[PDB]
Symmetry: C2
Subunit: 216 residues, 2 copies
Amino acid sequence: EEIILLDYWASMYGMRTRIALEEKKVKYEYREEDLSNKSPLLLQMNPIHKKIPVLIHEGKPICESIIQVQYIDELWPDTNPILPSDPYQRAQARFWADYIDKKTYVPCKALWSESGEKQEAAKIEFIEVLKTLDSELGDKYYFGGNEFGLVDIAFIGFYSWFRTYEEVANLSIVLEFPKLMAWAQRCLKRESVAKALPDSDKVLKSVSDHRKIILG
Amino acid sequence: EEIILLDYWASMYGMRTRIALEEKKVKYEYREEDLSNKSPLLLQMNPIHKKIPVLIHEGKPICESIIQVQYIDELWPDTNPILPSDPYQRAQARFWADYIDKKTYVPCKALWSESGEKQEAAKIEFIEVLKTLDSELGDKYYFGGNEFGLVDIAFIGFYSWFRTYEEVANLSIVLEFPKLMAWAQRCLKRESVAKALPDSDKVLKSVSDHRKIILG
Ligand SMILES: [Mg+2]
Ligand SMILES: [Mg+2]
């Protein structure tokens, strides 16, 4: 139970680790990091990347959200198992989490922080992700099949940003991807997800205010 | 034993999967892909990224080299185990493999394919990787500690390119990082590594000829 999570409230990546901890019914200390004034603990525990989320367990750091989720799953594998038991299914889940990380590394920032050609580039990339994930989900209840799993955790945090993407990047998500909206609604019925995701209007307000200040 | 590996002889990433298969004493079919004329099988099995290496097991694809290595380890966990048994050690091994992938994604190409400012940028990034990995290795025999492990597999393929990096990018590796040279020599004593890594002079000749043709 000796766990600290250094995180940023609106981080879709940190939300993954918040969800995994709640899935295991783990009590932990959440600490909010100021992204423009990172704590001494954060820089000490994540000297390589200096980024949130940072999971600290018995004073030892675990970095990278998908690696944190797997560490939590391996620590408590019998309570709400996150990864599949089958090796091949496991590899597919890791592949799609990796896909999300690779393809959202830039858009996660440029979608709200840029304009013009750099924001258009990010819009194109993110729409491609939504289409690809929508096709991979198909007609299943979850990316994990019949049960909520690793890939669901890997993407559900982005739902809290859909409203922001539609408004600051002139994207159409809710009306174009009803299967993803329905999937998000299924996931939100889990207490872990409901606790982890911030209000989407709060996200938008925060991002708009920041946007409007840094670029007019 | 029903395994096909679609790979490129000089791919340091594909070398990881070659090593993992040999570590498990698995007989498999290796197929060489022409990177400028990718096979129909490759595009079929890896439609998302269209890149090697692609591992095909009972006709099902597994993409991304570090994910392939873990899949092979989980299929045959008792023969030459690659990942640690301890969850925390496991997370650290995954973190350093992820670090290597993230920081070499661009240099793996720009170091030999570019010149001027883009090659200098890649040189700076790769030197930072070598320094960081050298510090993480410390005085241990392997990145995995007392035994060859995931991070060793994740980086040992780059040794076959050290000569190329020194010659085409005017880097100094062998004389600046004796601990990494000694580590590489330890790893090369394993049959899996000796079989997987191509001759470093053959790599250089191939890369120089390609370089000299595409840019004078
Ligand atoms: Mg499951
Ligand atoms: Mg080991």
